[PDB]
Write an enzyme that holds these catalytic residues in place. Structure first.
Site, PDB file in Angstrom:
ATOM      1  N   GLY A  72       0.977  -1.235   0.066  1.00 35.14           N
ATOM      2  CA  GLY A  72      -0.108   0.246   0.080  1.00 35.14           C
ATOM      3  C   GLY A  72       0.944   1.346  -0.120  1.00 35.14           C
ATOM      4  N   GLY A  73       1.062   2.110   1.186  1.00 33.42           N
ATOM      5  CA  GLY A  73       1.529   3.207   1.215  1.00 33.42           C
ATOM      6  C   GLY A  73       0.494   4.251   0.918  1.00 33.42           C
ATOM      7  N   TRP A  74       1.025   5.544   0.692  1.00 35.40           N
ATOM      8  CA  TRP A  74       0.134   6.761   0.811  1.00 35.40           C
ATOM      9  C   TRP A  74      -0.765   6.450  -0.682  1.00 35.40           C
ATOM     10  CZ3 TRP A  74      -1.597  10.602   3.384  1.00 35.40           C
ATOM     11  CH2 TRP A  74      -2.181  11.679   2.487  1.00 35.40           C
TER      12      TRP A  74
ATOM     13  N   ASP B  65       4.600  -6.101   5.511  1.00 37.84           N
ATOM     14  CA  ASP B  65       4.707  -4.780   6.129  1.00 37.84           C
ATOM     15  C   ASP B  65       3.266  -4.025   5.739  1.00 37.84           C
ATOM     16  OD1 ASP B  65       5.388  -2.387   7.629  1.00 37.84           O
ATOM     17  OD2 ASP B  65       5.819  -1.655   5.808  1.00 37.84           O
TER      18      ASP B  65
ATOM     19  N   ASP C 138       0.986  -0.922   5.234  1.00 40.47           N
ATOM     20  CA  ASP C 138       1.146   0.559   5.195  1.00 40.47           C
ATOM     21  C   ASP C 138      -0.281   1.170   4.736  1.00 40.47           C
ATOM     22  OD1 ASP C 138       3.583  -0.133   5.868  1.00 40.47           O
ATOM     23  OD2 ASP C 138       4.525   0.854   4.025  1.00 40.47           O
TER      24      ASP C 138
ATOM     25  N   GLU D 297      -2.739   3.741   4.916  1.00 38.09           N
ATOM     26  CA  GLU D 297      -2.916   5.139   5.213  1.00 38.09           C
ATOM     27  C   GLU D 297      -4.273   5.774   4.684  1.00 38.09           C
ATOM     28  OE1 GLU D 297       1.043   6.809   4.056  1.00 38.09           O
ATOM     29  OE2 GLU D 297       2.000   5.034   4.428  1.00 38.09           O
ATOM     30  N   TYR D 298      -5.114   5.744   5.609  1.00 41.38           N
ATOM     31  CA  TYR D 298      -5.243   5.319   7.243  1.00 41.38           C
ATOM     32  C   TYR D 298      -6.571   4.860   7.360  1.00 41.38           C
ATOM     33  CZ  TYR D 298      -1.557   8.895   7.106  1.00 41.38           C
ATOM     34  OH  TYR D 298      -0.577   9.906   6.722  1.00 41.38           O
TER      35      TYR D 298
ATOM     36  N   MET E 175       5.686   6.536  11.930  1.00 38.12           N
ATOM     37  CA  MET E 175       5.923   7.284  10.787  1.00 38.12           C
ATOM     38  C   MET E 175       6.083   8.620  11.517  1.00 38.12           C
ATOM     39  SD  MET E 175       4.305   5.849   7.421  1.00 38.12           S
ATOM     40  CE  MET E 175       2.608   5.852   7.965  1.00 38.12           C
TER      41      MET E 175
ATOM     42  N   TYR F  85       7.233  11.471  11.274  1.00 38.62           N
ATOM     43  CA  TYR F  85       7.734  12.383  10.277  1.00 38.62           C
ATOM     44  C   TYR F  85       6.752  12.960   9.449  1.00 38.62           C
ATOM     45  CZ  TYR F  85       8.461   7.970   7.637  1.00 38.62           C
ATOM     46  OH  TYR F  85       8.332   6.917   7.038  1.00 38.62           O
ATOM     47  N   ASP F  86       6.909  13.717   8.469  1.00 33.27           N
ATOM     48  CA  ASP F  86       5.650  14.340   7.898  1.00 33.27           C
ATOM     49  C   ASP F  86       4.931  15.055   8.794  1.00 33.27           C
ATOM     50  OD1 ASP F  86       6.784  13.739   5.180  1.00 33.27           O
ATOM     51  OD2 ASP F  86       5.574  11.954   5.039  1.00 33.27           O
TER      52      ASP F  86
ATOM     53  N   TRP G 203      12.818   6.299   5.942  1.00 34.11           N
ATOM     54  CA  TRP G 203      12.329   6.478   4.502  1.00 34.11           C
ATOM     55  C   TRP G 203      13.669   7.514   4.062  1.00 34.11           C
ATOM     56  CZ3 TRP G 203       8.536   4.381   1.465  1.00 34.11           C
ATOM     57  CH2 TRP G 203       8.553   5.123   0.256  1.00 34.11           C
TER      58      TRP G 203
HETATM   59  C1  LIG Z   1       0.800  15.132  11.357  1.00 32.96           C
HETATM   60  C2  LIG Z   1      -0.070  15.033  10.013  1.00 32.96           C
HETATM   61  O1  LIG Z   1      -1.394  14.841   9.961  1.00 32.96           O
HETATM   62  N1  LIG Z   1       0.714  15.380   8.988  1.00 32.96           N
HETATM   63  C3  LIG Z   1      -0.072  15.029   7.467  1.00 32.96           C
HETATM   64  C4  LIG Z   1       1.076  14.238   6.788  1.00 32.96           C
HETATM   65  O2  LIG Z   1       0.995  12.781   7.325  1.00 32.96           O
HETATM   66  C5  LIG Z   1       0.517  14.148   5.333  1.00 32.96           C
HETATM   67  O3  LIG Z   1       1.628  13.506   4.561  1.00 32.96           O
HETATM   68  C6  LIG Z   1       1.439  12.042   4.253  1.00 32.96           C
HETATM   69  O4  LIG Z   1       2.174  11.413   5.321  1.00 32.96           O
HETATM   70  C7  LIG Z   1       2.360   9.899   5.161  1.00 32.96           C
HETATM   71  C8  LIG Z   1       3.009   9.600   6.498  1.00 32.96           C
HETATM   72  O5  LIG Z   1       2.041   9.511   7.520  1.00 32.96           O
HETATM   73  C9  LIG Z   1       3.252   9.866   4.205  1.00 32.96           C
HETATM   74  O6  LIG Z   1       3.255   8.293   3.960  1.00 32.96           O
HETATM   75  C10 LIG Z   1       2.638  10.540   2.844  1.00 32.96           C
HETATM   76  O7  LIG Z   1       3.668  10.338   1.788  1.00 32.96           O
HETATM   77  C11 LIG Z   1       2.694  12.025   3.130  1.00 32.96           C
HETATM   78  N2  LIG Z   1       1.784  12.502   1.969  1.00 32.96           N
HETATM   79  C12 LIG Z   1       2.405  13.316   0.917  1.00 32.96           C
HETATM   80  C13 LIG Z   1       1.425  13.931  -0.005  1.00 32.96           C
HETATM   81  O8  LIG Z   1       3.392  13.885   1.303  1.00 32.96           O
HETATM   82  C14 LIG Z   1       0.396  15.383   5.001  1.00 32.96           C
HETATM   83  C15 LIG Z   1       0.221  15.373   3.292  1.00 32.96           C
HETATM   84  O9  LIG Z   1      -1.038  14.751   3.026  1.00 32.96           O
HETATM   85  O10 LIG Z   1      -0.637  16.215   5.500  1.00 32.96           O
HETATM   86  C16 LIG Z   1      -0.382  16.230   6.957  1.00 32.96           C
HETATM   87  O11 LIG Z   1      -1.560  16.828   7.608  1.00 32.96           O
HETATM   88  C1  LIG Z   2       8.356  10.528  -2.332  1.00 34.97           C
HETATM   89  C2  LIG Z   2       7.463   9.630  -1.490  1.00 34.97           C
HETATM   90  O1  LIG Z   2       6.534   8.974  -1.940  1.00 34.97           O
HETATM   91  N1  LIG Z   2       7.577   9.542  -0.079  1.00 34.97           N
HETATM   92  C3  LIG Z   2       6.512   9.443   1.122  1.00 34.97           C
HETATM   93  C4  LIG Z   2       7.034  10.286   2.128  1.00 34.97           C
HETATM   94  O2  LIG Z   2       6.483  11.430   2.453  1.00 34.97           O
HETATM   95  C5  LIG Z   2       6.606   9.576   3.578  1.00 34.97           C
HETATM   96  O3  LIG Z   2       7.721  10.152   4.305  1.00 34.97           O
HETATM   97  C6  LIG Z   2       6.803   8.069   3.442  1.00 34.97           C
HETATM   98  C7  LIG Z   2       6.062   7.384   4.676  1.00 34.97           C
HETATM   99  O4  LIG Z   2       6.722   6.309   5.126  1.00 34.97           O
HETATM  100  O5  LIG Z   2       5.701   7.707   2.440  1.00 34.97           O
HETATM  101  C8  LIG Z   2       6.519   7.715   1.139  1.00 34.97           C
HETATM  102  O6  LIG Z   2       5.686   7.301   0.042  1.00 34.97           O
END
Ligand SMILES: CC(=O)N[C@@H]1[C@@H](O)[C@H](O[C@@H]2O[C@H](CO)[C@@H](O)[C@H](O)[C@H]2NC(C)=O)[C@@H](CO)O[C@H]1O
Ligand SMILES: CC(=O)N[C@@H]1[C@@H](O)[C@H](O)[C@@H](CO)O[C@H]1O
Length: 368
Positions: free
Chosen positions: A79-81, A117, A119, A121-122, A194, A196-197, A348
């Protein structure tokens, strides 16, 4: 040793990045998570036949690595994002869960993986524009995990090996409200937070990708006081994830904005004018690129926030602001893993640090 080091490898490393499984230093990891398998018609399927099971043949390369490095465990990340839209359906009925779990066993046997694994989301809320949810996801994540654990146990017994089952979980504590982490924890071998982000160019203002603790100076709309590594770790521990199963995520990329006002903070928590320079796409930098090109270079200066425990770069000429994982911050997180008795570190992703500056620090602190 007491600690895992879980490195994501991106299948698309085998395109323009020209970074293949042969380039990985397997001495620096315990696990590779392969990003990603997709879901089609309720089944785990090959994500990219041009580099996975054919073409550049990354799966062959991972099996070669397993033969040379018997310690190594390779997991398929499902999966993943972008590819989470199939989970809600796959989890919703016993028939769909068995179909999914059986397809996951078939996949790891055919391609030589040591486990799965998840993934997703979510569950219930959040994810990409294409994402699908239902309220029942909160209980169905537990049921899908149980179906996978049972299928992998049965298959391992048949195969004379042990298959691991893991998951990636949101840094946002909404994930905890929308799951039963106290139940699923018992079935997962470990759980990769995760952490981060937390901030990125979805905001028009700057902030830290992975601040260690809350900085009350950051007061921008909708940005939670829990958007930091310690808040996320403590929330998952409180929710019932055992410390030894909780693995702390670290980013090996950075995010950039351009045209950020300096304010009183050299561009930190300021209104900006869109994405800044990136490596393979605007607004996203490999650590390799930051280290070679930007770290006190090309008009960028390094600053340290001793509240958040995070470094940033600011170019006063362009207003470009970079959030990235500095060794000073990563050392604090590695000490925290040890002080909390956590499960190790996840990152990552391994292609983003070619000199292994962060890769080597993680391995030196956590591995024997
Ligand atoms: C704290 C929070 O809610 N942050 C949101 C981010 O998590 C989200 O980014 C997405 O985070 C995923 C990890 O949880 C990554 O796998 C995913 O790639 C990433 N998506 C993008 C487009 O970068 C962001 C953006 O949707 O929103 C924040 O609110
Ligand atoms: C370039 C890309 O796709 N990177 C995303 C990244 O935002 C995130 O940190 C990670 C969560 O493990 O999921 C990845 O797919």
């Amino acid at each position: 040793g007491s600690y895992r080091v879980v490195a994501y490898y991106i299948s698309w490393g085998a395109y323009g990045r020209s970074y293949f499984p042969s380039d990985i230093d397997y001495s620096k990891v315990t696990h590779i998570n392969y990003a990603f398998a997709n879901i089609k018609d309720g089944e785990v399927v090959v994500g990219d036949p041009g580099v996975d099971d054919g073409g550049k043949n990354n799966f062959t390369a991972l099996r070669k690595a397993k033969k040379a490095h018997p310690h190594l465990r390779n997991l398929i990340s499902v999966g993943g994002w972008s590819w989470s839209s199939g989970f809600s359906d796959a989890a919703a009925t016993p028939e769909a869960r068995k179909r999914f779990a059986d397809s996951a066993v078939a996949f790891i046997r055919k391609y030589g993986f040591d486990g799965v694994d998840i993934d997703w989301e979510y569950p219930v809320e959040g994810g990409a524009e294409n994402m699908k949810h239902r309220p029942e996801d909160k209980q169905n994540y537990t049921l899908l995990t149980r179906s996978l654990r049972e299928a992998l146990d049965t298959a391992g017994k048949a195969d004379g090996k042990y298959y691991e089952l893991t998951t990636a979980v949101w840094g946002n504590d909404k994930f905890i409200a929308n799951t039963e982490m106290d139940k699923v924890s018992r079935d997962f071998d470990f759980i990769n937070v995760m952490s981060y982000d937390f901030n990125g160019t979805w905001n028009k203002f700057s902030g830290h990708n992975a601040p260690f603790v809350n900085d009350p100076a950051y007061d921008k709309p909708g940005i939670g006081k829990t958007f930091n590594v310690v808040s996320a770790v403590e929330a998952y521990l409180k929710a019932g994830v055992p410390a030894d199963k909780l693995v702390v995520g670290v980013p090996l990329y950075g995010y950039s904005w351009k045209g950020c006002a300096a304010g009183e903070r050299n561009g930190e928590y300021q209104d900006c004018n869109g994405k800044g320079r990136g490596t393979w796409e605007d607004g996203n930098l490999d650590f390799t690129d930051i280290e070679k090109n930007l770290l006190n270079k090309k008009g960028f200066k390094r600053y340290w926030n001793d509240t958040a425990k995070a470094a940033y770069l600011y170019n006063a000429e362009t207003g470009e602001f970079v959030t990235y994982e500095d060794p000073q911050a990563l050392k604090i997180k590695l000490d925290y893993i040890k002080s909390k008795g956590l499960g190790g570190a996840m990152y990552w992703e391994i292609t983003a640090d070619r000199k292994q500056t962060l890769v080597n620090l993680i391995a030196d602190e956590l591995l024997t």
